[PDB]
């Protein structure tokens, strides 16, 4: 009925994506909710209340879904920054299929008429589930079919007991809308006015920011003795901050927030002959339930040498192609680095600094203390971490008062109301009833699934690039490699695969 | 959702009491094939919240019209060849439907009998049969005694993809006291 | 999970009509609703016979 897009236009300001995949959705549950709980497997920080729903809901968080991996190129070259602005969404070409298994031969009847119902809520009443980076994104490529990942959600409890605070919902009570084969669905909406996202990385960093030659005005404390007296000291004295000297030449503005992090090597031979990794793993808590700290605030990974190290939680670990469930080894999975923020932010590893500690007098020597942790403070400047491609696009503001600078963990862009969620499911088909009243909630039923396309498009817009640098830039090349393997294409069976991740900042700008 | 059999393969029946020897114990009336819906009950329409915030905040309340309507009708034939039980989907065999609003049908409603809409929506319920008594005495049955035939009223006749409504008033009628006094 | 709606007995003798499981008596109630199956014939025999018929084809809806 409608008409497959898939495919970009370039309107310069603003540039359109489409793409449209196919899917499948199973009965889950057999057409009845469940209370769902921890095993109570003597681990009190982990338990879970929750419910799980046959409802289906498809959810396309992560840019691959969207952009092929040229025009993630093409834009990620050319641009400062860019935002969405609408999007539209078009259900059509819906059909079901039911399953019949006669003695052991498996039979699909094709069936008309036969409904399925959707709905989604653009007032934000449900449980918000996307976010938390879950697996089951539209595939990144186009021509493989997908299933559609069950629904669910947690609430309050203790244990495997549960509070009188604890909710409740029947997802029927919406409004759905019914959709039989040869109906199509479509909504518009809209995102709110949100910062552009930053694509650069700035090309000076802060203690270096002043001029060489001139020599500010300020002085500072040079020296305590003349030499000598020694006992008598000497008077203080003062020189002034000039070119020989960086460190006491004065600044305006402040790196910003920083918490530390464990260094662990890449090597085993230097990594903690003993055993570490929450003996360990730098944690917080709620209600004596510790959970380990997953990637944080922003901060550098590594200074210039080393490169070995990376930092034992923040850092992003994705798996590569084919990678295992459990216990797999490093060479499977793809780590991802920043050594581009070094121009503001910490390094994780590394201490904040020093600071004063005794006040001093004649008998009494100065002490200090490697400062641990640093919150917010006046006059300080950060970074916001990359998105790379695979990682999330869109996060949910938690709706709360207490706000500061909403900024996901994961990268992203805090929405007050992000898009809706769509929510899908098929109508229970009943089987054969008895003939005579049974009081009993009649629990049989016909097994059947279905399919459809889904279209999905978004407007995004742009900032172009006015740089007036004189020599070349630095750009994403793929290149050196004389390997047969090719990379971001089918191996010779036609299973797909991705090299490493490709991080957002490229380009420059002086700070 | 709803799931109609077929009763009695289609044909009336007289039922009498099973003569018992229980006096006070017998009966005279008639089964039929007909299916009926019947919602009396509130469960069916309110939910424990709704509930809870109505009858915290209201003195008295009433109802004043309804609206009602069925849709998404489909026939489902089920054939067994040997043991296989086998469900073929069928086109254009109809159903057939009809109210009454002369009251001129025995009012079977009332009695507080189970089988209303289920509580909780996801459940899908079978529609109970119809039937009802008569005057008599033990088994045997008056002259007084009456008999129908509800073939005999203009049922509108339903086919897949057509759907059925019907508004309705309530008459006006003293409010529901939702409130205990403070004082004897 | 009580009822909701009782009918008064259609009759001349009354003392405020009120139910007496609790309810709104009404004159005249929400109507029943009636519904059922076409019967649809199974095989019929190729030469006349004077019976009523009684085989079908077993269906639900």
């Given at each position: 009925?409608?008409?497959?897009?898939?495919?970009?236009?370039?309107?310069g300001d603003?540039?359109?994506?489409?793409?449209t995949?196919?899917?499948?959705?199973?009965?889950?549950?057999?057409?009845?909710?469940?209370?769902?709980?921890?095993?109570?497997?003597?681990?009190?920080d982990n338990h879970?209340?929750?419910?799980?729903?046959?409802?289906?809901?498809?959810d396309?968080n992560?840019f691959?879904?969207?952009?092929?991996?040229?025009?993630?190129q093409?834009?990620?070259?050319?641009?400062?920054?860019?935002?969405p602005?609408?999007?539209?969404?078009?259900?059509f070409?819906?059909?079901?299929?039911?399953?019949?298994?006669?003695d052991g031969?498996?039979?699909?009847?094709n069936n008309?008429?036969?409904t399925?119902?959707?709905?989604?809520?653009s007032?934000?009443?449900?449980?918000?589930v996307?976010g938390?980076?879950?697996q089951?994104?539209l595939?990144?490529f186009p021509?493989?079919?997908?299933?559609?990942?069950?629904?669910?959600?947690?609430?309050?409890?203790?244990?495997?007991?549960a509070?009188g605070?604890s909710?409740?919902?029947?997802?029927?009570?919406?409004?759905?809308?019914?959709?039989?084969?040869?109906?199509?669905?479509?909504?518009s909406?809209?995102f709110?006015?949100?910062?552009?996202?930053?694509?650069?990385?700035?090309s000076?960093?802060?203690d270096?920011?002043?001029?060489?030659?001139?020599?500010?005005?300020?002085?500072?404390?040079?020296?305590?003795?003349?030499?000598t007296g020694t006992?008598t000291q000497?008077?203080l004295?003062f020189?002034?901050?000039?070119?020989?000297?960086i460190?006491?030449?004065?600044?305006?503005?402040?790196?910003?927030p920083?918490?530390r992090?464990q260094?662990?090597?890449?090597?085993?031979?230097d990594?903690?002959?003993s055993?570490?990794?929450?003996?360990g793993?730098?944690?917080?808590?709620?209600?004596?339930?510790?959970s380990?700290?997953?990637?944080?605030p922003?901060?550098?990974?590594?200074?210039?040498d080393?490169e070995?190290?990376?930092?034992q939680?923040?850092?992003?670990?994705?798996g590569?192609?084919?990678?295992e469930?459990?216990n797999?080894?490093?060479?499977?999975?793809?780590?991802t680095?920043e050594?581009?923020?070094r121009?503001?932010?910490?390094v994780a590893?590394?201490?904040?600094?020093?600071?004063?500690?005794?006040?001093?007098?004649?008998?009494?020597?100065?002490a200090?203390?490697?400062?641990?942790?640093?919150?917010?403070?006046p006059?300080?400047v950060?970074?916001?971490?990359?998105?790379?491609?695979?990682?999330?696009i869109w996060?949910?503001?938690?709706?709360?008062?207490?706000h500061?600078?909403?900024?996901?963990?994961?990268?992203?862009?805090?929405?007050?109301?992000?898009?809706?969620?769509?929510?899908?499911?098929?109508?229970?088909?009943?089987?054969?009833?008895?003939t005579?009243?049974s009081a009993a909630?009649?629990?049989?039923?016909?097994?059947?699934?279905?399919?459809?396309?889904?279209?999905?498009?978004?407007?995004?817009?742009?900032q172009?690039?006015?740089?007036?640098r004189?020599?070349?830039?630095?750009?994403?090349?793929?290149?050196?490699?004389?390997?047969?393997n090719?990379?971001?294409?089918?191996?010779?069976?036609?299973?797909?695969?991705?090299?490493?991740?490709?991080?957002?900042r490229?380009?420059?700008?002086?700070l």
């Amino acid at each position: 009925s409608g008409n497959w897009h898939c495919d970009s236009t370039w309107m310069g300001d603003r540039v359109i994506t489409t793409s449209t995949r196919t899917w499948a959705l199973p009965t889950y549950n057999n057409h009845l909710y469940k209370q769902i709980s921890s095993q109570s497997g003597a681990s009190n920080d982990n338990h879970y209340f929750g419910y799980s729903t046959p409802w289906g809901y498809f959810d396309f968080n992560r840019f691959h879904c969207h952009f092929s991996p040229r025009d993630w190129q093409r834009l990620i070259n050319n641009n400062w920054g860019f935002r969405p602005k609408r999007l539209n969404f078009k259900l059509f070409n819906i059909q079901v299929k039911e399953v019949t298994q006669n003695d052991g031969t498996t039979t699909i009847a094709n069936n008309l008429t036969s409904t399925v119902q959707v709905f989604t809520d653009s007032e934000y009443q449900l449980p918000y589930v996307l976010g938390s980076a879950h697996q089951g994104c539209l595939p990144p490529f186009p021509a493989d079919v997908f299933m559609v990942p069950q629904y669910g959600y947690l609430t309050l409890n203790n244990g495997s007991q549960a509070v009188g605070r604890s909710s409740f919902y029947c997802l029927e009570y919406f409004p759905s809308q019914m959709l039989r084969t040869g109906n199509n669905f479509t909504f518009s909406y809209t995102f709110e006015d949100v910062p552009f996202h930053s694509s650069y990385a700035h090309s000076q960093s802060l203690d270096r920011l002043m001029n060489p030659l001139i020599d500010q005005y300020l002085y500072y404390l040079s020296r305590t003795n003349t030499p000598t007296g020694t006992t008598t000291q000497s008077r203080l004295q003062f020189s002034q901050a000039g070119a020989s000297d960086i460190r006491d030449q004065s600044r305006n503005w402040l790196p910003g927030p920083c918490y530390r992090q464990q260094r662990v090597s890449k090597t085993s031979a230097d990594n903690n002959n003993s055993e570490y990794s929450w003996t360990g793993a730098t944690k917080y808590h709620l209600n004596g339930r510790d959970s380990l700290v997953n990637p944080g605030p922003a901060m550098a990974s590594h200074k210039d040498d080393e490169e070995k190290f990376f930092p034992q939680s923040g850092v992003l670990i994705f798996g590569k192609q084919g990678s295992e469930k459990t216990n797999v080894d490093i060479e499977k999975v793809m780590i991802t680095d920043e050594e581009e923020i070094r121009t503001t932010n910490p390094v994780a590893t590394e201490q904040y600094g020093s600071v004063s500690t005794n006040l001093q007098r004649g008998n009494r020597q100065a002490a200090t203390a490697d400062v641990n942790t640093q919150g917010v403070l006046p006059g300080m400047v950060w970074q916001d971490r990359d998105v790379y491609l695979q990682g999330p696009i869109w996060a949910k503001i938690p709706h709360t008062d207490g706000h500061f600078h909403p900024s996901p963990l994961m990268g992203g862009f805090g929405l007050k109301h992000p898009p809706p969620q769509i929510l899908i499911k098929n109508t229970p088909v009943p089987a054969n009833p008895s003939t005579t009243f049974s009081a009993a909630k009649f629990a049989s039923f016909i097994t059947q699934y279905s399919t459809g396309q889904v279209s999905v498009e978004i407007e995004w817009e742009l900032q172009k690039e006015n740089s007036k640098r004189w020599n070349p830039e630095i750009q994403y090349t793929s290149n050196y490699n004389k390997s047969v393997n090719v990379d971001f294409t089918v191996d010779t069976n036609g299973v797909y695969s991705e090299p490493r991740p490709i991080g957002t900042r490229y380009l420059t700008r002086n700070l």
